[PDB]
Amino acid sequence: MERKRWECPALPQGWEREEVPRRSGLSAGHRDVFYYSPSGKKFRSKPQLARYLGGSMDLSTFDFRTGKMLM
DNA sequence: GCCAACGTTGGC
DNA sequence: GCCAACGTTGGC
């Protein structure tokens, strides 16, 4: 239950991935996953991410929750 | 007025 | 029953 954020190598240069554990309520302990662009914009779902990156790379096998390409 | 934080819901 | 995707809002 600590927040983690650094470079995601499945994405282009300067994109970062973050995990935030929820501290309270019914879903306490669940880890939300976010991505940050080089410009600092925050993404919270894959369709949202694919609107930015989907032109400039293939995202069909990118697993948003794990941050890796499924092979 | 935003947005981090948690809940709701549809699709499987 | 699970969870991807996002709706909603208290606290700022």
Which technique was used to obtain these atomic coordinates?
X-ray
Fold of the A1-71 domain: Methyl-cpg-binding Protein 2; Chain A (3.30.890)
Give residue limits of the domains in chain A. 1-71
d(CA A25, CA A40): 29
A26 touches strand B (CB under 7 A): yes
Coil vs helix vs strand at A12: coil
| Pairs from A2-10 (Cβ < 8 Å, separation ≥ 24) | A5/A36, A8/A35, A8/A67, A10/A62, A10/A67, A10/A68, A10/A69
Q: Which nucleotide lies closest to A45 by the C1' atom and the CA atom?
A: C5
Does the CB of A45 sit below 7 A from strand C?
yes
Which bases of strand C have any atom within 7 Å of the beta carbon of a protein residue?
A: 3-6
Cβ of residue A22 near strand C, that is under 7 Å?
no
DSSP state of A15: -
Q: Find tokens 């925050």 and name the residue.
A: A42
